[PDB]
Amino acid sequence: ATYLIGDVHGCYDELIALLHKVEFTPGKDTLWLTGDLVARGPGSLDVLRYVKSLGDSVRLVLGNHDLHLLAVFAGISRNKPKDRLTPLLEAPDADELLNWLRRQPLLQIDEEKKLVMAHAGITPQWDLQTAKECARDVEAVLSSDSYPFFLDAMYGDMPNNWSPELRGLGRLRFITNAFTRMRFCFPNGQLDMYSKESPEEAPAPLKPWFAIPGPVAEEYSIAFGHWASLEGKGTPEGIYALDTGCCWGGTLTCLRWEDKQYFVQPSNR
C-alpha cells in the first residue's frame, strides 16, 4: 500500500501511532512524507532517526523547517528556542542525520500513480519539466560540500515571479520559495510571501496556488503539506492538502492512495 502523511513537526509519538493504525509494513508498503519533519514538536531527533532508517520505503520532500534546521546546523542561522531542536543538534549522530537530510529531494514524482509531491505544492507558473529542473538544481546545491553558502543565499522574499531568464541568487531564492513557502498567488501566478491565513480570511485578490490552473495540476494529482491554516480543506479534485496541524494541537493525517482512505491521529499536545 501507499501512505501519504503531512507535516510531522517532531510529533514522533503521533507518527508511530498513525503508522501502527494502518499496519505500515516496510517492504510491502511505501510512505510519502510532505516534509517539515522537525521543529515545534518534541521529538525531532527520533523522527529523523526513524525516517532515515526506512530507506527506500519512504519518499520524502524537504520543507522550510527542514531547511532552517540545516541552516542552524551549518551556523548560518540562529536557533530559536521555540523550535525545540537542541536535542537533535546535540545528538552524537547529528552529523549523520543532517548530512542525510540535506541529500533528500524537493520533489517526488510517481508516473504510474500520476502523483506529484512537494512541500508547498507546484506553482502554476511551472510545467513538470521546469519543476524537475528546478528541484534538481537546488538539490545539487544542498548535497554539495558548499551547501552553507546556498542556505545563506536562500533567505529572501524576491523575486516572486518565475521566468526561465532568472539567473543566480534570485533563481535559487524563487525555486526555494515556490517549493517550500508558497501559499497564495496573485492572479498572474506571482507568489505572495506574507499571507498565511486560510483562503476565506485572506485579502483579495490573493488566491490559493491550487486555484490557478497550472500545467502540472491539469495532468497530475498533487499532494502537499505546509499550509496548516488550510486545515486540509477547500481543495479541488486532485489536490491533497495533508498538513492538518499536528504540532499545533490539530491532527496528523494519513492518506492511503489505493482507495483514497483517510486515517487520522489526534495530537497529544
Instruction: Please identify which residue in 18, 30, 36, 257 interacts with Mn ion, judged by CB under 5 A.
Output: 36
Q: 239 in helix, strand or coil? A: strand
Give the distance between the most distant pair of CA atoms in the chain.
49
Rounded to 10°, the helix 168-180/147-154 angle is 80
Closest of 110, 140, 134 to residue 31, by C-alpha? 110
**Which residue, 9 or 102, has its beta carbon nearer to Mg ion?**
9
Binding residues vs Mg ion (CB under 5 A): 7, 36
Closest of 175, 167, 170 to residue 130, by C-alpha? 175
Minimum distance between the CB of residue 9 and Mg ion, rounded to whole angstroms? 6
Minimum distance between the CB of residue 7 and Mg ion, rounded to whole angstroms? 4
Residue of closest CB approach to Mg ion: 36
**Which residue, 135 or 247, has its beta carbon nearer to Mg ion?**
247
Residue of closest CB approach to Mn ion: 226
Based on the shown chain and the rule CB under 5 A, indicate whether residue 244 belongs to the binding site for Mn ion.
no
- In whole angstroms, give the CA distance from residue 118 to residue 156: 20
Minimum distance between the CB of residue 181 and Mg ion, rounded to whole angstroms? 10
221-224 β-sheet, strand order:
107-110, 115-118, 221-224, 239-241
Q: Does the N-terminal peptide bond of residue 205 adopt cis geometry, omega within 30 degrees of 0?
A: yes
- In whole angstroms, give the CA distance from residue 167 to residue 170: 6
Cell numbers representing residue 133 in the block: 529542473
Based on the shown chain and the rule CB under 5 A, indicate whether residue 83 belongs to the binding site for Mn ion.
no
Cell numbers representing residue 159 in the block: 523575486
Cell numbers representing residue 137 in the block: 538544481
Instruction: Please identify which residue in 41, 63, 105, 214 interacts with Mn ion, judged by CB under 5 A.
Output: 63
**Which residue, 120 or 175, has its beta carbon nearer to Mg ion?**
120
Minimum distance between the CB of residue 118 and Mg ion, rounded to whole angstroms? 13
Instruction: Mark 248-267 with x for binding to Mn ion (rule: CB under 5 A) and - for no binding.
Output: --------------------
- In whole angstroms, give the CA distance from residue 248 to residue 88: 20
Based on the shown chain and the rule CB under 5 A, indicate whether residue 226 belongs to the binding site for Mn ion.
yes
Which does residue 66 touch among Mn ion, Mg ion, none (CB within 5 to 8 A, set by kind)? none
Based on the shown chain and the rule CB under 5 A, indicate whether residue 66 belongs to the binding site for Mn ion.
no
C-beta neighbour count of 197 within 10 angstroms: 13
Minimum distance between the CB of residue 40 and Mg ion, rounded to whole angstroms? 8
Which does residue 265 touch among Mg ion, Mn ion, none (CB within 5 to 8 A, set by kind)? none
Which residues, at least 6 apart from 259, have a Cβ–Cβ distance to it below 8 Å?
A: none
**Which residue, 66 or 192, has its beta carbon nearer to Mg ion?**
66
Based on the shown chain and the rule CB under 5 A, indicate whether residue 214 belongs to the binding site for Mn ion.
no
Which residues contact Mn ion (rule: CB under 5 A)?
36, 63-64, 226
